[PDB]
Amino acid sequence: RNGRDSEAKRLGVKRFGGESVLAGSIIVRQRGTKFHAGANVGCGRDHTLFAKADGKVKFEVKGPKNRKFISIEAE
Template identity: 85%
Template sequence: MAHKKAGGSTRNGRDSESKRLGVKRYGGEIVKAGSIIVRQRGTRFHPGINVGCGRDHT
């Protein structure tokens, strides 16, 4: 009989899914109503004239 124990499990090897944050439309670009300009966590960029701010600070 072979005397070899079963391999143990590792506790590492997990990473969260990327959130795809950042600027989506840059200066001078023409955008349509409802376009996402920036995805952010917290209000790093504040909305200007004729721009709204979503629930997730988009």
């Protein structure tokens, strides 16, 4: 007697770690903050993680709470 549903938003990691992405590429489209911005990586207003420079993506684990960061090194 309820039967309802919301249209999925296609979240998750679009471009993975190890990809030489372009300037302005969305690295991860998330809802919370499962991944934080790092070097040359911009965090959007919806916490969408975008790029600034070019190069391969690295998923770094740092911080006290072991939260995952993402950076882009130009190689």
